[PDB]
Symmetry: C2
Subunit: 375 residues, 2 copies
């Protein structure tokens, strides 16, 4: 067999988000094994709990690479967990397939990024909001590197467009008391809240937000780290009318997505939903396996070379590994949450967008990463 690692938060504040990623990866593995496996071998998943603990993510990655001798690790969600795994896969010349939207400003040669780069999510989210009258942003997120960097990007883009930030607050991951933040929002009276909270902190915020008398008609919240899965956990009654930006919705009308959702529901239950992180985790297993097949080997250097330019008929639409940076070409979509927790798409790119993690195509994003070179 060919052993593959699965490294996700199965416990802790992030487990609301990451458990269904392990499910999506195992489904793709089961599908590939039933079709004859890879290089004549079956895939054997080694599942490890990251426990929403970034030191634990690092030690588990070291064990999977050095002890279990996996060929690849599928996992991580928070950029804190990814950046904890980054030195491990780089030092061991391992591979991490990372399925979660994030802040960009990174391009490890040992990470394949299946989630949105900022030009494929956060940046067009701001532009669409601005173009639709939202000028005064209130920034709320969790206190770690992704929301801090995301809000750094958002402020620079808002300065370019002509908008302002009238509030900025951070809470530790797993925080549950949002009355103080909500009271500040009530006083500031912003046009929109841009929400970068991650994990089950979102359960507490959106419940306390509605209980405080605020609904989506009075103050829309645009979220980038929750989707259909978390919406079902929080409760669609607390999210109806609020906004998300992703590359994929369960409601996407493609033949590929129709098959994907039925298969996911057939395996895990008719009540189960799919969303963008779930799609990216499923995509990531298929793309890695396709690179191994093309390379004729699980050797990381050979897999890295073969993965350049590989395409996939993904549920969201056509995707492709960008050889420049090991990110994915993805379609951008913005939608509003429906009463049943599904997304009604309001806007999208007419084609997949090339990933641009360092925002090289955005003239206003010059000194954001502070890193030298051509990136």
């Amino acid at each position: 067999t060919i052993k593959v690692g699965i490294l996700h938060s199965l416990s802790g504040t992030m487990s609301i988000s990451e458990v269904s990623l392990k499910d999506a990866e195992l489904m793709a593995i089961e599908e590939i094994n039933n079709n004859g496996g890879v290089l004549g071998k079956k895939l054997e998943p080694i599942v490890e709990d990251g426990a929403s603990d970034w030191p634990t993510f690092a030690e588990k990655a070291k064990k999977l690479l050095q002890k279990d001798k996996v060929a690849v690790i599928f996992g991580a969600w928070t950029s804190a967990s990814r950046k904890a795994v980054l030195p491990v896969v780089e030092e061991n010349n391992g591979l991490l397939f990372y399925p979660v939207q994030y802040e960009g400003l990174e391009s490890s040669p040992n990470i394949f990024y299946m989630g949105a780069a900022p030009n494929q999510q956060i940046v067009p989210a701001v532009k669409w909001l601005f173009d639709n009258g939202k000028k005064r942003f209130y920034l709320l997120g969790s206190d770690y590197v992704f929301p801090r960097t995301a809000n750094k990007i958002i402020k620079a883009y808002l300065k370019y467009l002509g908008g302002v930030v009238v509030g900025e607050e951070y809470t530790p991951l797993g925080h549950t008391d949002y009355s103080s933040v909500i009271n500040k929002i009530k006083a500031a009276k912003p046009d929109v809240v841009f929400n970068t909270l991650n994990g089950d902190s979102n359960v507490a915020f959106f419940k306390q937000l509605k209980d405080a008398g605020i609904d989506a008609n009075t103050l829309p919240v645009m979220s980038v780290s929750i989707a259909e899965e978390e919406i079902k956990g929080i409760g669609p009654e607390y999210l109806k009318g609020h906004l998300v930006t992703w590359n994929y919705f369960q409601s996407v009308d493609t033949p590929e997505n129709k098959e994907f959702v039925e298969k996911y529901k057939k395996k895990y239950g008719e009540d189960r939903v799919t969303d963008d992180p779930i799609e990216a985790a499923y995509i990531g297993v298929y793309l890695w396996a396709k690179a191994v097949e093309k390379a004729g080997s699980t050797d990381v250097d050979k897999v890295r070379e073969a993965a350049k330019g590989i395409e996939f008929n993904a549920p969201e639409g056509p995707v492709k590994i960008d050889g420049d940076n090991q990110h994915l070409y993805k379609t951008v979509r913005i939608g509003e949450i429906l009463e049943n927790g599904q997304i009604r798409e309001l806007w999208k790119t007419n084609k997949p967008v090339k990933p641009d993690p360092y925002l090289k195509g955005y003239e206003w994003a010059q000194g954001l990463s502070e890193q030298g070179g051509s990136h």
Copy 2:
């Protein structure tokens, strides 16, 4: 902190059943930590994947006890996984809290059994079926020790009652092709199927059973290893009208269960269900913590002594650790599956039943 082990199948054919037990144990741990913890320390869970693989369960139990140095392990489902963990906890003098119904005929001093003993599930299931006109049983289960031992018990009891078995078939865990079994069932024309399939084999069987044109009125299926969680995974449209026997349903009307179901849905989502193994997993964390608090130590020998007789107002009703065998006194309930996957209770005992894993109160069970 006090490290505790969680050892369940988070991958493989058993994960349909066991992942929610990890959710239940983690919720109880969080509740206990928010009430000041245990002996002044918070509980730190170490979650390990058993991978529906009994050799993996044994190795993970060894790591949890020897390297992580946990004070207890909550986990296992299949009697194959429990019996692979059994020698590890005995050799290391560890403790396993095991929350799943099983065949009995076992009483490890290093295992606390929160799921039903056979006198608390399988045995009354047969008697109620027999007393309601089912005389010709067709037995179908997964090919390992629990369904084989359970069917041995069922055959002994049916011979005592005056019933007969007109069929008995086993499929390996994870089996998905039930056309042959269903064809044999169609030819045997049994009164009832007694289902001991475990894991996502149940998904394929019940779907193919309905698509073969067999409804619950024409042929009721009594199951002992699936409940509300698996019913939602399979789809209630295939289970509507079929039967189960447990000690708990989500629909149980007690004040404690109203609180339990509300808290479970509040943490994990309003669509999530509870069932008997989920309750037992939640029960086991609280009962272990109470034994530690009473003993004033996590030392296994002291915890074992303090646990004798400890009560708990469980969502299902009053329970208690039987000092004779470290099993739980539990109420017996039989119910039918509704259109929404919930259970309508048809019958129950008026009081919790003392656990009797060796069936010493049944003279027909002498030679097992």
